[PDB]
Design a protein around this ligand. Structure first.
Ligand SMILES: COC(=O)C1CCN(C(=O)[C@H](Cc2cccc(C(=N)N)c2)NS(=O)(=O)c2ccc3ccccc3c2)CC1
Ligand SMILES: [Ca+2]
Length: 223
């Protein structure tokens, strides 16, 4: 997260860290046994780490659970990043409590202007690479589709929305992918992509979760 702030230990209880000997992506706990992330984060041998703050130190409250199966959206396109959503089933159910909780799926799409909270352990620098130990947060509004499409001509699908600041300096970045975009207590987006990080007129593009509610529910119900 570039231009964000230290969230505070366990203040984002639904935030998940996807680990394979190091943190490579974020995710959101949607129920005791299912995590939603980005399809481009797909990797075998994934360990889901819940209740994390400092990812390098064991401080207590952590829960390391292996993924039993990662279901990448069947229509995910790795070039366009369209349908960039993946469901991960936990080998065991997470122990939900004050520091490890699930986030609700939206019942309707969020409108432009809506302020959301984006979080993750991704790169904190626009020019260079600097990864934080603790979770970083960023509050950012959902942009209008006209502005979004103006920023990324021919790259925005109906399953994507822009959120961030056109002036640059504040945005999600590498390592944040798969992470949550929560608006009014609902998971509206998944950190997907962007041209660089915190660049002027190049906001972050996120997977529009409200377009996937039925798919998520149906897939979970059949798995
Ligand atoms: C297929 O999955 C990948 O290989 C991933 C590589 C990383 N990736 C990116 O968008 C990167 C870094 C990144 C990641 C997440 C959010 C932002 C942001 N600015 N909000 C930037 N930004 S980038 O400018 O280097 C970039 C942008 C668009 C891309 C589209 C397809 C493939 C790689 C891409 C890389 C997403 C796709
Ligand atoms: Ca830790």
């Amino acid at each position: 997260i570039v231009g964000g702030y230290t969230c505070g230990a366990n203040t984002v209880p639904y935030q998940v860290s996807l680990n394979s000997g190091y943190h490579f992506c974020g995710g959101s706990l949607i129920n005791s046994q299912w995590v939603v992330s980005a399809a481009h984060c797909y990797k075998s041998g994934i360990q889901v780490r819940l209740g994390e703050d400092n990812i390098n130190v064991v401080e207590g409250n952590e829960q390391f659970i292996s993924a039993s199966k990662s279901i990448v959206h069947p229509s995910y396109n790795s070039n366009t990043l369209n349908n960039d959503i993946m469901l991960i089933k936990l080998k065991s159910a997470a122990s939900l409590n004050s520091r490890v909780a699930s986030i609700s799926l939206p019942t309707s799409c969020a409108s432009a202007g809506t302020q959301c909270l984006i979080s993750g352990w991704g790169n904190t620098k626009s020019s260079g690479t600097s990864y934080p130990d603790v979770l970083k947060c960023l509050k950012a509004p959902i942009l209008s589709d006209s502005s979004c499409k103006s920023a990324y001509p021919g790259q925005i699908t109906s399953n994507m929305f822009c959120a961030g600041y056109l002036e640059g300096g504040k945005d999600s970045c590498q390592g944040d992918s798969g992470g949550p975009v929560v608006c009014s207590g609902k998971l509206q987006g998944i950190v997907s992509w962007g041209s660089g990080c915190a660049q002027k007129n190049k906001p972050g593009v996120y997977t529009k979760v409200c377009n996937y509610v039925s798919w998520i529910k149906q897939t979970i119900a059949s798995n």
